[PDB]
Design an enzyme around this catalytic site. Sequence first.
Site, mmCIF file in Angstrom:
data_model
loop_
_atom_site.group_PDB
_atom_site.id
_atom_site.type_symbol
_atom_site.label_atom_id
_atom_site.label_comp_id
_atom_site.label_asym_id
_atom_site.label_seq_id
_atom_site.Cartn_x
_atom_site.Cartn_y
_atom_site.Cartn_z
ATOM 1 N N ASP A 351 0.845 -1.182 0.000
ATOM 2 C CA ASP A 351 0.000 0.000 0.000
ATOM 3 C C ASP A 351 0.887 1.241 0.000
ATOM 4 O OD1 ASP A 351 -2.495 1.184 -0.061
ATOM 5 O OD2 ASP A 351 -2.793 1.105 2.125
ATOM 6 N N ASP A 703 -2.852 -1.417 5.632
ATOM 7 C CA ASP A 703 -3.352 -1.090 6.961
ATOM 8 C C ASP A 703 -4.832 -0.755 6.991
ATOM 9 O OD1 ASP A 703 -3.313 1.337 5.644
ATOM 10 O OD2 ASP A 703 -2.203 2.398 7.221
ATOM 11 N N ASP A 707 -7.501 -2.349 1.521
ATOM 12 C CA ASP A 707 -6.881 -3.517 0.912
ATOM 13 C C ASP A 707 -6.937 -4.737 1.823
ATOM 14 O OD1 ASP A 707 -5.193 -2.414 2.739
ATOM 15 O OD2 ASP A 707 -3.484 -2.178 1.382
HETATM 16 N N1 LIG Z 1 -12.689 10.501 3.473
HETATM 17 C C1 LIG Z 1 -12.394 10.746 2.008
HETATM 18 N N2 LIG Z 1 -13.377 11.523 1.593
HETATM 19 C C2 LIG Z 1 -13.403 11.934 0.304
HETATM 20 N N3 LIG Z 1 -12.417 11.537 -0.560
HETATM 21 C C3 LIG Z 1 -11.430 10.756 -0.150
HETATM 22 C C4 LIG Z 1 -11.385 10.337 1.131
HETATM 23 N N4 LIG Z 1 -10.316 9.582 1.290
HETATM 24 C C5 LIG Z 1 -9.705 9.543 0.071
HETATM 25 N N5 LIG Z 1 -10.374 10.261 -0.796
HETATM 26 C C6 LIG Z 1 -10.031 10.440 -2.206
HETATM 27 O O1 LIG Z 1 -10.819 9.388 -3.076
HETATM 28 C C7 LIG Z 1 -9.955 8.582 -3.653
HETATM 29 C C8 LIG Z 1 -10.338 7.107 -3.370
HETATM 30 O O2 LIG Z 1 -10.011 6.735 -2.037
HETATM 31 P P1 LIG Z 1 -8.871 5.516 -1.911
HETATM 32 O O3 LIG Z 1 -9.435 4.159 -2.080
HETATM 33 O O4 LIG Z 1 -8.060 5.760 -3.113
HETATM 34 O O5 LIG Z 1 -7.923 5.708 -0.589
HETATM 35 P P2 LIG Z 1 -6.303 6.047 -0.841
HETATM 36 O O6 LIG Z 1 -5.745 5.240 -1.977
HETATM 37 O O7 LIG Z 1 -6.128 7.496 -1.074
HETATM 38 C C9 LIG Z 1 -5.359 5.445 0.640
HETATM 39 P P3 LIG Z 1 -4.113 4.190 0.103
HETATM 40 O O8 LIG Z 1 -2.988 4.871 -0.712
HETATM 41 O O9 LIG Z 1 -3.550 3.559 1.379
HETATM 42 O O10 LIG Z 1 -4.787 3.138 -0.720
HETATM 43 C C10 LIG Z 1 -8.535 8.922 -3.095
HETATM 44 O O11 LIG Z 1 -7.617 9.207 -4.068
HETATM 45 C C11 LIG Z 1 -8.721 10.200 -2.302
HETATM 46 O O12 LIG Z 1 -7.988 11.339 -2.980
HETATM 47 CA CA LIG Z 2 -3.600 2.883 3.603
#
Ligand SMILES: Nc1ncnc2c1ncn2[C@@H]1O[C@H](COP(=O)(O)OP(=O)(O)CP(=O)(O)O)[C@@H](O)[C@H]1O
Ligand SMILES: [Ca+2]
Length: 994
Positions: A351, A703, A707
């Site tokens: 991740d 985490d 995933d």
């Molecule tokens: N609480 C939240 N509310 C609104 N949008 C969010 C959000 N958390 C993340 N997003 C945006 O929506 C998209 C989809 O969330 P996502 O599944 O991709 O989590 P993430 O990839 O940013 C954490 P990781 O890198 O650990 O997977 C992200 O790119 C983020 O920019």
């Molecule tokens: Ca994460």
Amino acid sequence: MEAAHSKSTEECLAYFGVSETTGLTPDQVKRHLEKYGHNELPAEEGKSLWELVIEQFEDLLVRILLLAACISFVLAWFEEGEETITAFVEPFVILLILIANAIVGVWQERNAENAIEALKEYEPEMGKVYRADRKSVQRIKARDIVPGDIVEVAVGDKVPADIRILSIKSTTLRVDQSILTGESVSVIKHTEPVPDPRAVNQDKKNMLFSGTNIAAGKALGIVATTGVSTEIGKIRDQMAATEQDKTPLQQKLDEFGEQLSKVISLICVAVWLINIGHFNDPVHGGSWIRGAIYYFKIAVALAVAAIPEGLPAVITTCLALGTRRMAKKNAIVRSLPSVETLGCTSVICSDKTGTLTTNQMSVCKMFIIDKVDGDFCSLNEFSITGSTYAPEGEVLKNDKPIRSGQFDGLVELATICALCNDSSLDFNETKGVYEKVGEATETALTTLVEKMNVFNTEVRNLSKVERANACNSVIRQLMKKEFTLEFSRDRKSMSVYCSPAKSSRAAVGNKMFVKGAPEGVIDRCNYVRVGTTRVPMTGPVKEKILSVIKEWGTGRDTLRCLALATRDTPPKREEMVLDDSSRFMEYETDLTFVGVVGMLDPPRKEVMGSIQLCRDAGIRVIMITGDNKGTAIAICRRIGIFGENEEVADRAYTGREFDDLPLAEQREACRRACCFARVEPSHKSKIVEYLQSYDEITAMTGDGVNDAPALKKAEIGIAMGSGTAVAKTASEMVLADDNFSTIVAAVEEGRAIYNNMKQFIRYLISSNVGEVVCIFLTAALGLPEALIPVQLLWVNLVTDGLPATALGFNPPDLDIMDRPPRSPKEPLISGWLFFRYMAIGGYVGAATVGAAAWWFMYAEDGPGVTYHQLTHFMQCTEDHPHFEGLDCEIFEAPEPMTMALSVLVTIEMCNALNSLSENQSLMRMPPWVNIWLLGSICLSMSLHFLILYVDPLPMIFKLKALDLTQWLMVLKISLPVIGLDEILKFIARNYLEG
Ligand SMILES: Nc1ncnc2c1ncn2[C@@H]1O[C@H](COP(=O)(O)OP(=O)(O)CP(=O)(O)O)[C@@H](O)[C@H]1O
Ligand SMILES: [Ca+2]
Ligand SMILES: CCCCCCCC/C=C/CCCCCCCC(=O)OC[C@H](COP(=O)(O)OCC[N+](C)(C)C)OC(=O)CCCCCCC/C=C/CCCCCCCC
Ligand SMILES: [Ca+2]
Ligand SMILES: [Ca+2]
Ligand SMILES: [K+]
């Protein structure tokens, strides 16, 4: 305790006397603790019954030697030739080696459980409660939760106690009840009552059970019961199906053990059978039965000697030692095979956010629209100081502090961040730092609203607890959040529908505030908020907004970016279907662009070093993230996955780029691409699934709830200590330290355990070959009997015992982290290793028979020469060689048996000195790399001297070995076995070509 679940929402609030918005008073909490106790369950057990762990006499090879101790004890019950002193020591020498290893195995296994339990106290689980002493939500230790508390839970949270659901703040709440009800799928909850007081837990679809995990949603509730009165506490020490299984290597060795024990069975018959003509010889009176019983004993003594009986004890030791070293590296091992499987791992999926980064979110740059005139777009671009969640910073334009209230665009920006947000901020009075309550991507926005202070609110006289949510609460009083369109990850967006608070202070109409990943939100924006007015979205303005996000993400700070937008004309409330998670995207259309925040997320300092070691060890690392492709590749370059100016066109795909590929090209992408961005939970699982199609051993690291599917299907799943309980449930190993480099040392430990079994086997097999070569070579060459039932038992104890067991504590081989990973297809023993088993055992079995022979011929000490003798047994029986000089009863003398047995013991202690590595000579790994081997060597050698020089013992065994020229001959014969394997290690050291 509230005895029932069937009560309404009002009654549960009234049974305890508590407010839905305030929570228990500090007086009610103090008085519930001393009445209801803490929210604890006793440590289930210590798993060391002092009896259950000692009873490891359960493997086949151990209970075989238990059989031998029974028949040697019954053959001691029949007395022949005053062997009682020698017959009753036969079973005890068998049992002593079984006890010697059982002491070690039980030791290291209890010693390893001592480290696992001591790592549970590391970071105590905490919950989210509302109490009167603070105005916002509060982080308290979970053991301090009492009935009557108002507990809040969201996605990823593990429910701390049985809770009656008071209000669900999402469109749907879905809970994982696999641990309690067996329902292997997330189930829906609600607040409507259920009447039956006895209705089973599956029917109680209005409560949250301790130990269960929240799959989706966010709800508020009241604690029904805590402690052992919890629905899961009723099953702690009563009902369970304890899962225990042998590891892929431990099962491979049970196959190797059983097939080998039947081969020895044929040998011990082939030894009994070949000496059929000696049953009538006069050593035992010529009686057919009193001769056959004797040779039945030597087959038993040969079996237990040839059998590697320390195998099931040294496997338990290596696994317990590995678990105990990872627990010392602050890594909880939740599944026993995880340490060994992670050794032969070839691909590490990982991740991005939280896992590879610190998840220390903080907004540092943001921008709103300044001017729009034709093709020209102008941006008011701000910078924000402050690198923690503390509301302590300044907003700067043109490198000087400004007041956020000046720019109307920043007002709406702070209003979006404050409302479209399920995360708050709590102050820890002990640590003195502000901690995130909820998702860090949102607490980052929470801190930004406090730093902006867009309404000029008097925050100077506010306490460090009241200051956390000061400016946010002001905005939360201007418009009321009616309902939330929670976060889906199909559209990558979150939204809220709000109305003005009084309907008289503001009659602007209803509004929806949406924040999400910029690429999706900007596509759904037909308008642009310029100051306090609105202009239609155009080609020029859109490309300008996108080019800045592309710069902030690929720059030296590799910024995480969100987009903020408001919908000015939302649908009427009745018009919206709050059931289909697919239709929420439609509701988030015709949006008006407000601005974009650029968040800072430092990569963990341990990551770049940990990838260097994976590439040297032949382990490929892939970043898997939902975050922007621009940010993903830039972070890969920073942490070392990619070169500082390496081309990356073919080895980085987005979620949609990946799905446009046909299936064959999708798999090829998984075998070359090191970066996957804008993926979804399903994409993470399918990437790992494709890697497993190539028979890779894949390891996933994550985490968040993001995933969890990828962590399960992966061969090994490693979770972060900071991560959600959903992921820790799906992981075979947890890093409570958040230390990413612990994974590499685990790979080392996973390789070292295998390389230490390859030497435990090379020692005993090659050593016990000579023990069988000895027995056959004397009977085949007509030489007299050179060993005794109790003499094989003694060689078994001091050579197949603690020196063999102490090989498990061998240090890691030198180039163990420089050779590519082991394929789990490789055979346990190669065609070449079986050769070196024989080249050693040949010289072991020939040097032991040539030791007793040398004494016959070249001794010229005590008894003399027999230079070329057929050694017919009868010669002394009856003169038959027509000898004028017959040398009566010179055969069967006690010195050659002592002479041969000392070689057979010393040569194996010398062989153990080569069992430190597989191919490294003693020039590079000296004998003192394993102190506990040299200790067990001196143990065998000295304890072997007692049965030769304290006077009553060399009559139970046979007589002394002489002074100077006898030990020198044993030593000068044995030591060349080291030089032999030393050459064999040198041959393979430079003959790997093929
Ligand atoms: N609480 C939240 N509310 C609104 N949008 C969010 C959000 N958390 C993340 N997003 C945006 O929506 C998209 C989809 O969330 P996502 O599944 O991709 O989590 P993430 O990839 O940013 C954490 P990781 O890198 O650990 O997977 C992200 O790119 C983020 O920019
Ligand atoms: Ca994460
Ligand atoms: C005078 C001439 C020389 C005479 C030599 C005589 C030798 C006498 C002393 C011997 C001591 C050596 C014993 C070695 C035991 C072999 C197995 C073993 O290598 O173990 C080692 C472990 C170590 O601990 P660790 O892994 O936590 O440290 C980890 C630290 N890092 C990580 C740095 C490695 O220790 C353990 O396993 C737990 C320790 C428990 C000890 C079990 C062995 C004792 C057996 C007793 C029964 C035998 C009966 C005797 C019969 C005679 C009649 C009475
Ligand atoms: Ca043995
Ligand atoms: Ca042996
Ligand atoms: K699995």
